[PDB]
Amino acid sequence: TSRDITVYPKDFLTYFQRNGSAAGFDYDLATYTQTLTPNKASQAGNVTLKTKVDMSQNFTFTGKINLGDKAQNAGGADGVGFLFHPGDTNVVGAPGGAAGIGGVNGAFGFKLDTYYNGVGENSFTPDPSNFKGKPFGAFVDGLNGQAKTIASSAQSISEPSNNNFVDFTMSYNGATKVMSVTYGGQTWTQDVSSFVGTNQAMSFSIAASTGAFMNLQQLRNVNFTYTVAQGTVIANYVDEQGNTIAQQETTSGDIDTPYVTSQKTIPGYTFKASNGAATSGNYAANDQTVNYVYTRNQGSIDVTYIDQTTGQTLSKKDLSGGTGDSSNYTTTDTIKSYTDAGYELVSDNYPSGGTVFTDTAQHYVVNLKQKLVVSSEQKQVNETIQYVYEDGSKAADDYNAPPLNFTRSVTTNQVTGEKTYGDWQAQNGDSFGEVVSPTIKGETADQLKIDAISGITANSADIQKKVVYKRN
Ligand SMILES: OC[C@H]1O[C@H](O[C@H]2[C@@H](O)[C@H](O)[C@@H](CO)O[C@@H]2O)[C@@H](O)[C@@H](O)[C@@H]1O
Ligand SMILES: [Ca+2]
């Protein structure tokens, strides 16, 4: 790769960032020395690596470490921790009995512990009992956040004395996944594959701390040859309420190397914004996340209710919902409403099996007409001639003349009330005939005939007449 580099003492600070105590002390380019903690109490200072490390590839770390001038008995603490973890390049471990390895998740390393911590805190498990008051060099399991010393790797080291620099070496094999540490003639080896696991990129921190006891702790002549791990970009395709709606898109590539992310076209959904990182840019050591946020596509359906008679809209219902969901609408209720007020349904193009919201808008029409009930009107004009004597007794049988019937058509508007009365039509005619009055022997009728009466109209009043017979 192009990522095989070699950090010289000359360019230490170019790849390493002094943090905590260490920030108050210049890198003396004469001696090639970085103070981590001074001889003061309660200190905490480290160097973090600017990049991460390819744990599929081989690295070698060469330097000298001063652990200080005092042993634990003389008031000397706490040691130098070497931390490897998968998260942030700027995350470092807890001081004290945590050695700069505890209190980080997925953490592992090698410590130089110049103080015996017998007491258990959340950040760290007691130090190996077989090293009470004695200084030791060991591997640490920091994965569950709690730094646990691997008692199998715990050997003794020379007590810090006269601020002397002892030669340190940490080597790693990519495929073996095997760490080889060498501090002044003592040698360690561990297979870290149970720690490195899937993560082939781990951030590198070299920490130092003091407490109630203290010690000047410093690094000199640093030579790190490693393969710099490549940066990641994550792209997440999510709805407005965070739910993932398309498979995310992890992508790795060298640092300061362009990255490009894709606006996905997602059925049912429309791109709103990209929160988080840019959609494009350059790859970096800590990993950047761009989230594409989608709005759930909403469909239209209108159902216009028209009065054909007036050619005027009674009601328009607007429906809106997500593309795929049911409107749960039926015309029947709104139809009924109008049919109660005396409308008649002519047409309904709205599906009886209900609708569903679609990306294309839907338009439906229900046509009603003002109902018209065709009544029949009837009227009869009748003529009666009574034939009586002068005592009012019946002389002859009443003449009921063939009645003149009349028929109209009424049309009642079941909405407005308006009645549309037709043309008064004579079924039998307009003429009431002349009626020659019966001849009674030995009498004379006052009217010997009733004269024919024409122009009878539908509202003409019934003709009533009386023929009186006088004796002789
Ligand atoms: O006094 C504050 C101090 O607390 C911590 O140290 C304790 C322990 O973890 C140390 O090993 C010993 C000797 O150094 O002293 C304490 O008992 C650490 O949190 C330290 O950095 C802090 O300043
Ligand atoms: Ca300790």
- Rounded to the nearest angstrom, the distance between the alpha carbon of 79 and the centre of ligand 1 is 12
Residue with CA closest to ligand 1 atom 18: 96
Method used experimentally? X-ray
Three-state secondary structure call for residue 176: coil
Residue with CA closest to ligand 1 atom 14: 211
| Resolution for the entry shown, Å | 3.0
Distances (CA, A) of 206 to 16, 30, 79, 217: 10, 21, 11, 11
Contact of 277 with 233, CB cutoff 8 Å:
yes
Three-state secondary structure call for residue 343: strand
d(CA 461, CA 298): 72
d(CA 263, CA 266): 9
Residue with CA closest to ligand 1 atom 23: 42
List CB contacts of 263: < 8 A, sequence separation 6 or more: 271, 274, 279, 292
> Of 76, 74, 75, 120, whose CA–CA distance to 97 is shortest?
120
Name the one residue in this structure whose structure tokens are 């008649």: 344
DSSP codes joined into one string, 25-78: S--BTTTTEEEEE-SSSS-EEEEEESS-EETTS-EEEEEEEE--S--GGGTB--
- Rounded to the nearest angstrom, the distance between the alpha carbon of 95 and the centre of ligand 1 is 7
Structure-block tokens of residue 151? 């008692």
Which residues lie at CB < 5 A from ion ligand 2?
A: 97, 113, 115, 117, 127
Contact of 213 with 70, CB cutoff 8 Å:
yes
> Of 272, 319, 269, whose CA–CA distance to 299 is shortest?
319
**What are the chain's domains?**
4-227 (2.60.120.200), 231-296 (3.10.20.320), 299-370 (3.10.20.470), 373-471 (2.60.40.4300)
Q: Which helix (H) or strand (E) holds 124?
A: none
Give 179's strand partners: 172, 190
List CB contacts of 456: < 8 A, sequence separation 6 or more: 381, 404, 426, 429, 430, 431, 432
Structure-block tokens of residue 190? 């561990």
> Of 332, 334, 342, 344, whose CA–CA distance to 308 is shortest?
344
- Rounded to the nearest angstrom, the distance between the alpha carbon of 128 and the centre of ligand 2 is 9
Query: Nearest 5°: CA angle at 469, between 466 and 470?
Result: 140
* Strand locations in 73-177 (E): 79-85, 104-113, 136-145, 148-149, 155-156, 165-173
Contact of 62 with 260, CB cutoff 8 Å:
no
Q: Which residues are annotated as part of the binding site for Ca(2+)?
A: 113, 115, 117, 127
